Amino acid sequence: AQSFLNRVCGVSAARLTPCGTGTSTDVVYRAFDIYNDKVAGFAKFLKTNCCRFQEKDEDDNLIDSYFVVKRHTFSNYQHEETIYNLLKDCPAVAKHDFFKFRIDGDMVPHISRQRLTKYTMADLVYALRHFD
């Protein structure tokens, strides 16, 4: 629906615009620095399980910030919740907000990271390494 976005703005600056489709994620092509039980290295991939939303400055200006909500699993939700509650005090931590929103018959957990920036430092570093 639409009131999902109303749930997204939470308590501050609801001057938001959908940064793509409706109540679903959007696809982006970004660099990562990954390492696990298979793939390994620092290179470009295609992230998808994320819904972007842009904050709109006063006078309806397109400010430079974003609200990024991500869908997940579940144990992930409680784990991340635990850690965030444990660490919420250092200044250099983007204020998160966790909740659950029902789409179909499914109060799926959603994680909203607030007032971030478009391009992670990873993007900058890559673009300066593999310049063309």
Side-chain angles (χ1 to χ4, degrees):
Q2 197 270 359
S3 54
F4 156 72
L5 187 136
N6 286 343
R7 176 57 194 80
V8 169
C9 64
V11 310
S12 313
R15 297 284 294 273
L16 325 177
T17 174
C19 196
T21 173
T23 62
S24 58
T25 62
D26 191 306
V27 294
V28 292
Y29 204 71
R30 294 297 230 278
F32 286 70
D33 169 17
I34 196 62
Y35 166 68
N36 58 19
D37 298 335
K38 34 165 64 176
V39 297
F42 161 64
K44 277 280 203 49
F45 296 74
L46 193 145
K47 217 180 200 271
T48 176
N49 59 328
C50 309
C51 318
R52 285 287 173 103
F53 301 93
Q54 181 172 0
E55 186 170 8
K56 202 176 298 176
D57 180 16
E58 186 61 30
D59 320 331
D60 304 334
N61 290 312
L62 286 183
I63 203 174
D64 174 32
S65 294
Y66 285 104
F67 275 47
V68 179
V69 58
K70 196 176 309 179
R71 207 157 299 100
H72 305 282
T73 80
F74 201 87
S75 46
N76 194 334
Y77 183 81
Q78 297 82 55
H79 188 77
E80 202 79 17
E81 169 75 39
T82 306
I83 317 186
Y84 182 32
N85 300 317
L86 288 170
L87 271 158
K88 198 161 62 177
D89 312 343
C90 178
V93 178
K95 197 266 213 175
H96 286 65
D97 175 12
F98 300 168
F99 72 101
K100 292 219 305 308
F101 197 97
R102 197 188 201 67
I103 303 308
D104 305 339
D106 48 9
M107 283 180 288
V108 171
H110 295 49
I111 282 183
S112 63
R113 326 200 178 116
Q114 311 179 345
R115 299 185 155 94
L116 283 181
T117 318
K118 200 174 179 183
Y119 294 142
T120 70
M121 299 202 72
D123 281 316
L124 158 73
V125 179
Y126 189 101
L128 258 174
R129 295 279 270 258
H130 314 64
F131 175 81
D132 163 37

